[PDB]
Design an enzyme around this catalytic site. Structure first.
Site, PDB file in Angstrom:
ATOM      1  N   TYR A  28       0.810  -1.238   0.000  1.00 50.11           N
ATOM      2  CA  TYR A  28       0.000   0.000   0.000  1.00 50.11           C
ATOM      3  C   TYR A  28       0.852   1.301   0.000  1.00 50.11           C
ATOM      4  O   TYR A  28       0.700   2.164   0.870  1.00 50.11           O
ATOM      5  CB  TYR A  28      -1.052  -0.224   1.118  1.00 50.11           C
ATOM      6  CG  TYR A  28      -0.817   0.179   2.589  1.00 50.11           C
ATOM      7  CD1 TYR A  28       0.129  -0.411   3.457  1.00 50.11           C
ATOM      8  CD2 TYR A  28      -1.775   1.056   3.115  1.00 50.11           C
ATOM      9  CE1 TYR A  28       0.072  -0.119   4.825  1.00 50.11           C
ATOM     10  CE2 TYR A  28      -1.874   1.260   4.471  1.00 50.11           C
ATOM     11  CZ  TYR A  28      -0.956   0.669   5.335  1.00 50.11           C
ATOM     12  OH  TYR A  28      -1.100   0.795   6.692  1.00 50.11           O
ATOM     13  N   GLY A  30       1.211   4.560  -1.561  1.00 53.15           N
ATOM     14  CA  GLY A  30       0.345   5.491  -2.310  1.00 53.15           C
ATOM     15  C   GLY A  30      -0.725   6.120  -1.392  1.00 53.15           C
ATOM     16  O   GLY A  30      -0.875   5.765  -0.218  1.00 53.15           O
ATOM     17  N   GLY A  32      -3.790   6.497   0.426  1.00 55.64           N
ATOM     18  CA  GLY A  32      -4.889   5.627   0.914  1.00 55.64           C
ATOM     19  C   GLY A  32      -4.458   4.178   1.134  1.00 55.64           C
ATOM     20  O   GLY A  32      -3.947   3.874   2.216  1.00 55.64           O
ATOM     21  N   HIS A  48       4.976   8.368   5.498  1.00 56.68           N
ATOM     22  CA  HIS A  48       5.335   9.424   4.501  1.00 56.68           C
ATOM     23  C   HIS A  48       4.228   9.757   3.451  1.00 56.68           C
ATOM     24  O   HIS A  48       4.120  10.938   3.126  1.00 56.68           O
ATOM     25  CB  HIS A  48       6.782   9.197   3.970  1.00 56.68           C
ATOM     26  CG  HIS A  48       7.132   9.523   2.516  1.00 56.68           C
ATOM     27  ND1 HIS A  48       7.207   8.586   1.491  1.00 56.68           N
ATOM     28  CD2 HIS A  48       7.578  10.780   2.082  1.00 56.68           C
ATOM     29  CE1 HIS A  48       7.711   9.399   0.505  1.00 56.68           C
ATOM     30  NE2 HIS A  48       7.967  10.718   0.762  1.00 56.68           N
ATOM     31  N   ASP A  49       3.425   8.796   2.943  1.00 55.53           N
ATOM     32  CA  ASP A  49       2.257   9.103   2.061  1.00 55.53           C
ATOM     33  C   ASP A  49       1.040   9.819   2.747  1.00 55.53           C
ATOM     34  O   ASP A  49       0.374  10.600   2.071  1.00 55.53           O
ATOM     35  CB  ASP A  49       1.846   7.901   1.167  1.00 55.53           C
ATOM     36  CG  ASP A  49       1.291   6.620   1.803  1.00 55.53           C
ATOM     37  OD1 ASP A  49       0.379   6.861   2.795  1.00 55.53           O
ATOM     38  OD2 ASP A  49       1.612   5.495   1.427  1.00 55.53           O
ATOM     39  N   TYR A  52       2.408  13.383   3.591  1.00 58.36           N
ATOM     40  CA  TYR A  52       2.166  13.947   2.237  1.00 58.36           C
ATOM     41  C   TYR A  52       0.682  14.251   1.867  1.00 58.36           C
ATOM     42  O   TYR A  52       0.458  15.222   1.145  1.00 58.36           O
ATOM     43  CB  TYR A  52       2.780  12.978   1.210  1.00 58.36           C
ATOM     44  CG  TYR A  52       4.272  13.186   0.883  1.00 58.36           C
ATOM     45  CD1 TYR A  52       5.266  13.737   1.731  1.00 58.36           C
ATOM     46  CD2 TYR A  52       4.586  12.916  -0.447  1.00 58.36           C
ATOM     47  CE1 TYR A  52       6.521  14.050   1.185  1.00 58.36           C
ATOM     48  CE2 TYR A  52       5.786  13.343  -0.967  1.00 58.36           C
ATOM     49  CZ  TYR A  52       6.711  13.997  -0.174  1.00 58.36           C
ATOM     50  OH  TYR A  52       7.747  14.713  -0.715  1.00 58.36           O
ATOM     51  N   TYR A  73      13.189  22.771  -1.412  1.00 55.31           N
ATOM     52  CA  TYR A  73      13.880  22.363  -0.154  1.00 55.31           C
ATOM     53  C   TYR A  73      15.075  21.377  -0.318  1.00 55.31           C
ATOM     54  O   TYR A  73      15.178  20.593  -1.267  1.00 55.31           O
ATOM     55  CB  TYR A  73      12.876  21.847   0.922  1.00 55.31           C
ATOM     56  CG  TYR A  73      12.232  20.456   0.731  1.00 55.31           C
ATOM     57  CD1 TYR A  73      12.865  19.282   1.182  1.00 55.31           C
ATOM     58  CD2 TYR A  73      10.943  20.380   0.199  1.00 55.31           C
ATOM     59  CE1 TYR A  73      12.184  18.066   1.139  1.00 55.31           C
ATOM     60  CE2 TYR A  73      10.277  19.161   0.158  1.00 55.31           C
ATOM     61  CZ  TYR A  73      10.885  18.015   0.651  1.00 55.31           C
ATOM     62  OH  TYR A  73      10.184  16.844   0.717  1.00 55.31           O
ATOM     63  N   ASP A  99       9.199  13.742   4.199  1.00 54.88           N
ATOM     64  CA  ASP A  99      10.497  13.236   3.674  1.00 54.88           C
ATOM     65  C   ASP A  99      11.609  12.976   4.771  1.00 54.88           C
ATOM     66  O   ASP A  99      12.537  12.211   4.497  1.00 54.88           O
ATOM     67  CB  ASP A  99      10.868  14.323   2.628  1.00 54.88           C
ATOM     68  CG  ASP A  99      12.067  14.067   1.719  1.00 54.88           C
ATOM     69  OD1 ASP A  99      12.994  13.325   2.009  1.00 54.88           O
ATOM     70  OD2 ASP A  99      12.005  14.790   0.562  1.00 54.88           O
TER      71      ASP A  99
HETATM   72 CA   LIG Z   1      -1.005   4.188   2.371  1.00 56.61          CA
END
Ligand SMILES: [Ca+2]
Length: 124
Positions: A28, A30, A32, A48-49, A52, A73, A99
């Site tokens: 998973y 990405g 969601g 991190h997703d 983000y 950055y 990040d």
């Molecule tokens: Ca996810």
């Protein structure tokens, strides 16, 4: 895009390999995805997703601005100790702080040696 994110994960990974191994792997990775991971190194892509998700949407610089990932950055290092350009601002500090728990978290979690170009009928 996430390209000086590769610069980032040399800094916070004493041992383990970035994107070349870390990009294709696990279930998973990405916006969601919700099963779980496979091993929790799809779980460092989970954090991190969704950091983000709050960064593509962000109160400090709101998106008539258009600053999504790594373009303006850059960062700091050492333990694993990744942050940002250490005068670090409001919204430039947020996208480099997601990040950060990308680069740190590839050294915090396990690894997908297994799910490394995955299967997930199996894992998710
Ligand atoms: Ca996810």
């Amino acid at each position: 895009a996430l390209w000086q994110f590769r610069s980032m994960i040399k800094c916070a990974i004493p041992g383990s390999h970035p994107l070349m191994d870390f990009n294709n792997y696990g279930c998973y990775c990405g916006l969601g995805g919700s099963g779980t991971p496979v091993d929790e190194l799809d779980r460092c892509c989970e954090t991190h997703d969704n950091c983000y998700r709050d960064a593509k949407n962000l109160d400090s610089c709101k998106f008539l601005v258009d600053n999504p990932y790594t373009e303006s950055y850059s960062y700091s290092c050492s333990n694993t100790e990744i942050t940002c350009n250490s005068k670090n601002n409001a919204c430039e500090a947020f996208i480099c702080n997601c990040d950060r728990n990308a680069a740190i978290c590839f050294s915090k979690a396990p690894y997908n040696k297994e799910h490394k170009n995955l299967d997930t009928k199996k894992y998710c």
